[PDB]
Design a protein around this ligand. Sequence first.
Ligand SMILES: COc1cccc2c1cc([N+](=O)[O-])c1c(C(=O)O)cc3c(c12)OCO3
Ligand SMILES: CCCCCCCCCCCCCC(=O)O
Ligand SMILES: CCCCCCCCCCCCCC(=O)O
Ligand SMILES: CCCCCCCCCCCCCC(=O)O
Ligand SMILES: CCCCCCCCCCCCCC(=O)O
Ligand SMILES: CCCCCCCCCCCCCC(=O)O
Ligand SMILES: CCCCCCCCCCCCCC(=O)O
Length: 582
Amino acid sequence: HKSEVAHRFKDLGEENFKALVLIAFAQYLQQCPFEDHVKLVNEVTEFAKTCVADESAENCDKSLHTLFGDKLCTVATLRETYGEMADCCAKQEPERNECFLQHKDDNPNLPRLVRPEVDVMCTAFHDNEETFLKKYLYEIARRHPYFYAPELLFFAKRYKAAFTECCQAADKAACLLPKLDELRDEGKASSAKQRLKCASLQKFGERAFKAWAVARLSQRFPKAEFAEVSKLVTDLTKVHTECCHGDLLECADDRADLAKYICENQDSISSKLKECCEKPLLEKSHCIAEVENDEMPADLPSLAADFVESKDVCKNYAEAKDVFLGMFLYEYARRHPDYSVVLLLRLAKTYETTLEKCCAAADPHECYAKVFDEFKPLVEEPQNLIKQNCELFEQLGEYKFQNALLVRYTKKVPQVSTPTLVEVSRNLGKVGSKCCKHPEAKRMPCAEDYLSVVLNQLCVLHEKTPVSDRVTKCCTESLVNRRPCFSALEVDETYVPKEFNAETFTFHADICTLSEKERQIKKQTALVELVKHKPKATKEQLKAVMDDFAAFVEKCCKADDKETCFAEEGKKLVAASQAALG
Ligand SMILES: COc1cccc2c1cc([N+](=O)[O-])c1c(C(=O)O)cc3c(c12)OCO3
Ligand SMILES: CCCCCCCCCCCCCC(=O)O
Ligand SMILES: CCCCCCCCCCCCCC(=O)O
Ligand SMILES: CCCCCCCCCCCCCC(=O)O
Ligand SMILES: CCCCCCCCCCCCCC(=O)O
Ligand SMILES: CCCCCCCCCCCCCC(=O)O
Ligand SMILES: CCCCCCCCCCCCCC(=O)O
């Protein structure tokens, strides 16, 4: 177009335009005050409007990269605040924008964002909606400078509905806090997959990413032909490679191009895309990414004919090995939306290894005849684990399910910090709660998605503060092998028990007067610390001690004197528990 900024403004709408321009400045100038970015936004928006009225007005034909970089270089404090990033302004485009991109700081060391009281939030929301929500947007954007801006905007708009509904409710906090917790966990998760996907592309290559994408898109678009899936995989690989480089506008163009191709070809891809494809550009590609799987075609034949029985297996494979493995993966995936993507990749890897071994033999068919039997234990292993864990979650409830996991994992890797053991065990309990309510045909994809987020969080914490080599291995192997690796962890035999520290097992009266969540953590903390002190304790000996602590709390809490109970009866529980484990 003659004026990129006019076209963006017309397509997006003023309100969406303003929001994104705020996110984009906040992601680059992460240390500047909210009020400075509001002024930059208003100037850029006023200029955009001059181009909307006349596409030939002065400077309106400059690239949006040029205008954005030009405006970055107007910031008076650029050098004093950002140092060498101010030297980016001495370059011309496209080198200037590349330079700015390299100075985004993924760890800007900003104070934690403190959640105000519910009534303070609802009063701020009422008295000034715009500043209230837009300031928070700026705060999140400047802490998450690679977070895809449109998706950050999609989260922000859902906060409005939450405040509109809950601030007119009778119990405002009971209404509002669960939704804000859900929105925040959803945001942190989306951030987790984004950074996880880019890291995986760098370490394990384009080929491995394409394999993941064949499987995922074949589950999603089972009626599409392989040639069509393969094209989508190529284009999707390009989009993610560009989006991982990190420039908003080049990412957004690639994503919109793919969405428009998908929407122009729905007849050959999926019957479930009509709604997404009538949405505005801003939302189309995100909507398509969340489309539910199309219904699979009826009475599809078994894979045995083309991949085991045919005389031409080895010949078709040898001609173009990755194209044939892709076809095997496409046929298997489209038939099994109930499988994790990584389970499908394990079947593909198994098939490839067998073909590599067997096509060398004189009778390849006899060699690979039973290959589909090799898939049986790979499929049943996750299926059985889901059943086991969903049964225990129902028997125990979320909390006591968390406690069963906490003891299990503390014994397996007792060297992990207690805060991490508590947080990870809790989050794993929440994966059980979420995914065990899905029917069996959607449980493995759910667990794959939410475990990826939890195990990724574990691994980042552990890379930052390494303590266990077994965890470093599970965290550094292929993503296909990460969860089985962790599942294979065994109780640590060579752990020397941590020395007794009395204050660790000293509880005061405040425990009764604490948020139910914080009371769970503190109880979960002493449970880990108990296991860390006596890692050979039995389930019998542990539930016995945990029952004594449960009386110790309920008595000393509803007592005329609470403190003296905690200190005197506290020595009694510790000494009894000490003898009951030593
Ligand atoms: C893209 O993320 C956001 C966009 C827009 C608003 C918010 C938000 C993220 C968060 N947060 O901190 O994760 C919150 C919280 C919270 O959870 O404390 C409390 C709030 C919020 C937001 O708007 C007013 O009150
Ligand atoms: C058509 C392009 C993709 C073809 C992929 C065929 C299968 C590749 C090998 C098996 C999967 C390996 C996955 C991984 O190493 O992470
Ligand atoms: C000075 C303006 C700089 C920022 C401009 C932001 C434009 C973002 C458009 C995003 C469209 C999303 C499309 C898609 O994700 O498929
Ligand atoms: C950056 C990704 C843009 C996505 C555009 C639509 C592509 C097809 C959607 C099917 C699901 C893809 C999920 C994924 O991208 O990991
Ligand atoms: C506590 C987590 C949810 C309950 C069941 C989890 C069982 C292990 C993971 C299932 C499969 C995930 C993906 C995979 O490795 O194929
Ligand atoms: C983060 C605490 C120490 C390490 C814990 C490893 C986590 C293993 C989870 C593997 C997948 C679920 C297994 C299960 O649900 O039984
Ligand atoms: C070394 C002696 C320690 C004795 C005290 C151990 C306290 C463990 C409490 C764990 C409670 C978890 C279950 C519950 O929520 O009641």
